Amino acid sequence: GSDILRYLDFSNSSGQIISTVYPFYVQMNYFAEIKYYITYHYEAKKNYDEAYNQSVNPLMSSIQNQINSCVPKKAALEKTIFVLEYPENHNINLSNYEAKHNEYKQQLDAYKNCVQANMESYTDRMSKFNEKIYSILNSVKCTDACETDTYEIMLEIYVERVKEVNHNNYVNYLSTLKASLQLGVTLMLKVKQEIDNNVTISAINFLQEEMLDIITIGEAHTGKIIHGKENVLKLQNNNIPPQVPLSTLKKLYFDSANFYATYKFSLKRADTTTAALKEKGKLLANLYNKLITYVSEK
Numbered sequence: 490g491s492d493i494l495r496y497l498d499f500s501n502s503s504g505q506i507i508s509t510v511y512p513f514y515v516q517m518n519y520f521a522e523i524k525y526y527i528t529y530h531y532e533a534k535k536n537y538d539e540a541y542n543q544s545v546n547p548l549m550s551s552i553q554n555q556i557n558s559c560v561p562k563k564a565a566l567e568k569t570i571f572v573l574e575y576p577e578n579h580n581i582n583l584s585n586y587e588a589k590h591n592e593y594k595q596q597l598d599a600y601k602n603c604v605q606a607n608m609e610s611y612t613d614r615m616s617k618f619n620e621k622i623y624s625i626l627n628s629v630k631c632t633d634a635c636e637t638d639t640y641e642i643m644l645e646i647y648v649e650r651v652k653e654v655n656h657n658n659y660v661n662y663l664s665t666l667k668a669s670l671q672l673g674v675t676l677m678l679k680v681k682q683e684i685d686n687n688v689t690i691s692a693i694n695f696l697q698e699e700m701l702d703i704i705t706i707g708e709a710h711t712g713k714i715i716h717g718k719e720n721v722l723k724l725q726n727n728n729i730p731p732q733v734p735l736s737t738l739k740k741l742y743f744d745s746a747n748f749y750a751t752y753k754f755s756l757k758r759a760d761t762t763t764a765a766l767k768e769k770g771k772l773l774a775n776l777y778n779k780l781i782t783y784v785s786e787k
C-alpha cells in the first residue's frame with residue numbers, strides 16, 4: 490500500500506509548504522475559503538465568483554498539469570524506494586544497493602525540482618489575485634457603518650472546526666516515535682562496529698532516515714496546524730465592536746480565512762503522514778528481526 494504522496498511535501502526558507510497533492514498551495518485553499526465566506530455580500534460574491542473563474546481556475550489547471558507531468562518521475566522514485574526497502578526480496582547485493590541509494594537521492598532531487606518548478610511565477614499570480622480581492626470587497630455596500638455579522642458567523646464556524654480534533658496526539662506521537670528512531674540510529678552505529686555491512690543493515694539505515702524525514706515534514710505541518718488553530722481561538726477571545734469600518738472588516742475577513750486555510754491545508758496532510766509511519770514502522774520492525782538472525786549465529 491505504498492504511496493509517497495501521503496507525506497511528501499516540500500518546505501523551504503520562508504516556511505512555505507509546497508504540497509504534491511491538491512490544492513498544492515495554501516493560497517488556493519484560502520481563495521476557496523473566501524468564496525463562501527462572503528456569500529451574503531451579494532454583489533461582492535458575484536464579482537468574486539467571476540474573478541475566481543477567470544484567474545484561480547486556469548491557474549489551478551496549470552499547476553495540476555505540471556504535477557501530472559511529474560508522475561513518471563514520481564514512479565521511478567517510488568520503484569527505487571521499493572528496492573531499497575526490500576533488498577533481500579529483490580536479491581540485490583550491497584554494492585548495487587549503495588548505487589540504488591545514490592540513484593534515490595538524484596531522483597528525489599529531480600522530482601522536487603519538477604514539483605517546485607515555476608513556484609515563483611505561481612506565487613506571483615496568487616499574489617496578484619489576492620490584491621484583486623481587496624478591491625472586489627469594495628462592493629460591500631456599507632462604507633463606515635459595516636456590521637460584523639458575517640465575521641462572527643464565520644469565526645464561530647472556524648472555531649468549532651478547529652476544536653474537532655486534538656492536535657496534541659499528533660505531536661506526542663511524532664515526538665515519541667522520533668525519539669525511538671534516534672535510539673535506533675545510535676544502536677545501528679554500534680551494530681556497524683560489530684557486524685559486517687549487509688543489505689539488511691543498509692535497509693534499516695535507509696528506513697530510519699526516511700521515517701525521520703517524514704517526521705520532519707509532519708512537524709512542519711504540525712506547526713501550521715497549531716498556528717492556525719490558536720489564532721482562530723484567539724480571535725474569539727478578542728472583543729470586536731458591533732460596528733467597524735470597511736477597511737477593518739476586510740482585514741478581519743482575510744485574517745480569519747487565512748488562519749483557517751493554514752490550519753486546513755496542513756491538517757489534511759498530518760493525517761496521511763501518520764499512516765505512512767505505520768507502514769514504514771511495520772517494515773522496520775521486521776528489518777530489525779531479520780538482522781537479529783544474522784547477529785545471533787555469528
Ligand SMILES: [Cl-]
Pocket residue numbers: 661662665
Ligand atoms: Cl503516543
